[PDB]
C-alpha cells in the first residue's frame, strides 16, 4: 500500500520497465482544474492545487529548448520518482497525470482565447514541437462529488505500455491498461493491421489514425477512409430506423436530407446529428459529434462509437463486441489496443466507453491507484 493521507487519493508510479529506465529517469506531473475556481492548476508534492500562472514559463529551475521554429521557456511542474515516487491528488477535474521516460515534459503556460490561463502539451502534429521524440504517456482522470474515474488512453497515440490499478476502501479492485512489452507490441500491430493502418507506426510511436502525423486527417492518404461506409449507412436509414436501447432509453432515427433526427421513447422526431460526418469526425468525435442537449450528446456517443466499430447498420448488437470490427472501414488501430489490454478494455478512439468497452476505472470511495509504467 502506497502512502496515504486523510482526505486525498494517492497514486502511485510504478517502474515496470525492467531496467530501460530507472526512477530518477521518470517524470510525472498533474495538471487540472480546480473544481472550485475552474483555474488550470498544478498539483504540488502535498497534494495542493497551485494555480498555473504565465510567469511559470521564467521562474527558477525552469526549461528550455531550441526547436527549429527557435528557442524558448516552459513551466516545469514536473518531479522525478527518486525525489517522490507518488503523487496525493484532492478532489480535481479534467485532470492528466503526464509521465514521461528520460526527460520531462515541455509545457508551454499560456492564455487561451476565452480568457482564461491555461497550457499546451505535446501537439505532435506539429513536428517542430519541443516534446518531439519524447517517450511518454498520460493518465486521465478526474475526482469529483460522484467518485474518482481513472484511465489509460490510447486516443492519440501508444508509445510505451502502461496499466493503471485503482483500489476503492470498500472493496473494488481493479486493472485496465496494455499488455505485453513495447517491442512485442510494436511489432505485433505492424503484423496485425490493414494496409491503410500500417504507417501509423513510428519508432517512437504509433499515432492514432487522426491524431499527431497520423494518416487520416484531411490532408492524408486516408483522409477519406470512412466516406463510403458513411454514404451507405446515411443512404440506408434514409428508409429504415436505426433503433437501439441503452441505459438513458431507447431512441430510435432515421436520416431526413442530411440531419439524422431521433426521437425516445417513442416520442416525437427532434434529437439531432446535425449533418453527415467527415472519416475525421467518426475517428474524432467532434464536428457534428459535438454539442447539443444530454440526449443528443449519448445519441452522438453511440453513433460516432458505432462507425469506429462498423455496426451501425446492427443496432442489436452495438453492446457485443463479437460484432465489433468485423470489416472495413473500422477503427483497426482501436482494435488493436483492445486485442492487447486486460479483459480488452482499452480507450482506443474516444467515444470506446460507449457500453462501458473504455479502460476507464470508477468508484465512488477511492483509496490509491499504482500507475504500472512499462517497456
Same mark, same amino acid.
Given at each position: 500500500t502506497p502512502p496515504l493521507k486523510s482526505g486525498f487519493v494517492t497514486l502511485q508510479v510504478k517502474?515496470?520497465?525492467?531496467?530501460?529506465?530507472?526512477?530518477?529517469?521518470?517524470?510525472?506531473?498533474i495538471?487540472?482544474?480546480?473544481?472550485?475556481?475552474?483555474?488550470?492548476?498544478?498539483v504540488?508534492?502535498?497534494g495542493?492545487?497551485?494555480?498555473?500562472?504565465?510567469?511559470?514559463?521564467?521562474?527558477?529551475?525552469?526549461?528550455?529548448?531550441?526547436?527549429?521554429?527557435?528557442?524558448?521557456?516552459?513551466?516545469?511542474?514536473?518531479?522525478?520518482?527518486?525525489?517522490q515516487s507518488y503523487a496525493y491528488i484532492p478532489?480535481i477535474?479534467?485532470?492528466?497525470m503526464?509521465?514521461?521516460?528520460?526527460?520531462?515534459?515541455?509545457?508551454?503556460?499560456?492564455?487561451?482565447?476565452?480568457?482564461?490561463?491555461?497550457?499546451?502539451?505535446?501537439?505532435?502534429?506539429?513536428?517542430?514541437?519541443?516534446?518531439?521524440?519524447?517517450?511518454?504517456?498520460?493518465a486521465?482522470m478526474?475526482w469529483?462529488?460522484?467518485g474518482l474515474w481513472i484511465?489509460?488512453?490510447?486516443?492519440?497515440?501508444?508509445?510505451?505500455?502502461?496499466?493503471i490499478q485503482l483500489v476503492g476502501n470498500s472493496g473494488y479492485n481493479k486493472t485496465?491498461?496494455?499488455?505485453?512489452?513495447?517491442?512485442?507490441?510494436?511489432?505485433?500491430?505492424?503484423?496485425?493491421?490493414? =494496409?491503410?493502418?500500417?504507417?501509423?507506426?513510428?519508432? +517512437?510511436?504509433?499515432?492514432?489514425? /487522426?491524431?499527431?502525423?497520423? @494518416? $487520416? &486527417?484531411?490532408?492524408?492518404?486516408? =483522409?477519406?477512409?470512412?466516406?463510403?461506409?458513411?454514404? +451507405?449507412?446515411?443512404?440506408?436509414? /434514409?428508409?429504415?430506423?436505426? @433503433? $437501439? &436501447?441503452?441505459?438513458?432509453?431507447?431512441?430510435?432515427?432515421?436520416?431526413?436530407?442530411?440531419?439524422?433526427?431521433?426521437?425516445?421513447?417513442?416520442?416525437?422526431?427532434?434529437?439531432?446529428?446535425?449533418?453527415?460526418?467527415?472519416?475525421?469526425?467518426?475517428?474524432?468525435?467532434?464536428?457534428?459529434?459535438?454539442?447539443?442537449?444530454?440526449?443528443?450528446?449519448?445519441?452522438?456517443?453511440?453513433?460516432?462509437?458505432?462507425?469506429?466499430?462498423?455496426?451501425?447498420?446492427?443496432?442489436?448488437?452495438?453492446?457485443?463486441?463479437?460484432?465489433?470490427?468485423?470489416?472495413?472501414?473500422?477503427?483497426?488501430?482501436?482494435?488493436?489496443?483492445?486485442?492487447?489490454?486486460?479483459?480488452?478494455?482499452?480507450?482506443?478512439?474516444?467515444?470506446?466507453?460507449?457500453?462501458?468497452?473504455?479502460?476507464?476505472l470508477h468508484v465512488a470511495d477511492p483509496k490509491y491507484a499504482i500507475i504500472n509504467?512499462?517497456?
Open positions: 517502474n515496470n520497465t525492467n531496467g530501460q529506465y530507472s526512477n530518477d529517469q521518470i517524470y510525472w506531473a495538471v487540472g482544474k480546480d473544481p472550485d475556481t475552474k483555474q488550470f492548476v498544478h504540488d508534492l502535498n495542493n492545487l497551485i494555480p498555473m500562472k504565465i510567469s511559470d514559463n521564467d521562474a527558477a529551475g525552469h526549461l528550455t529548448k531550441t526547436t527549429p521554429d527557435g528557442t524558448f521557456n516552459y513551466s516545469n511542474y514536473f518531479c522525478k520518482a527518486s525525489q478532489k477535474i479534467g485532470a492528466r503526464y509521465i514521461s521516460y528520460g526527460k520531462p515534459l515541455y509545457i508551454k503556460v499560456n492564455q487561451a482565447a476565452d480568457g482564461l490561463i491555461g497550457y499546451a502539451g505535446p501537439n505532435l502534429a506539429n513536428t517542430s514541437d519541443p516534446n518531439t521524440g519524447i517517450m511518454f504517456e498520460w486521465e478526474a469529483t462529488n460522484d484511465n489509460t488512453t490510447r486516443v492519440d497515440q501508444f508509445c510505451y505500455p502502461y496499466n485496465y491498461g496494455d499488455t505485453g512489452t513495447r517491442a512485442d507490441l510494436m511489432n505485433a500491430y505492424k503484423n496485425s493491421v490493414p =494496409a491503410e493502418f500500417k504507417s501509423l507506426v513510428h519508432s +517512437d510511436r504509433i499515432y492514432a489514425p /487522426a491524431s499527431g502525423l497520423g @494518416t $487520416f &486527417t484531411a490532408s492524408q492518404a486516408n =483522409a477519406h477512409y470512412f466516406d463510403s461506409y458513411i454514404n +451507405d449507412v446515411y443512404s440506408y436509414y /434514409a428508409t429504415h430506423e436505426l @433503433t $437501439f &436501447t441503452c441505459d438513458r432509453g431507447t431512441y430510435s432515427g432515421h436520416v431526413v436530407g442530411n440531419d439524422f433526427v431521433f426521437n425516445k421513447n417513442g416520442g416525437a422526431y427532434n434529437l439531432y446529428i446535425h449533418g453527415k460526418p467527415s472519416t475525421q469526425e467518426v475517428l474524432l468525435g467532434n464536428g457534428i459529434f459535438d454539442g447539443g442537449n444530454d440526449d443528443e450528446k449519448a445519441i452522438k456517443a453511440q453513433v460516432c462509437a458505432a462507425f469506429n466499430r462498423h455496426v451501425m447498420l446492427d443496432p442489436a448488437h452495438w453492446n457485443n463486441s463479437a460484432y465489433f470490427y468485423k470489416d472495413a472501414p473500422a477503427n483497426y488501430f482501436a482494435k488493436f489496443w483492445h486485442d492487447h489490454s486486460y479483459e480488452n478494455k482499452s480507450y482506443g478512439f474516444c467515444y470506446d466507453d460507449v457500453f462501458d468497452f473504455s479502460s476507464t509504467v512499462g517497456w
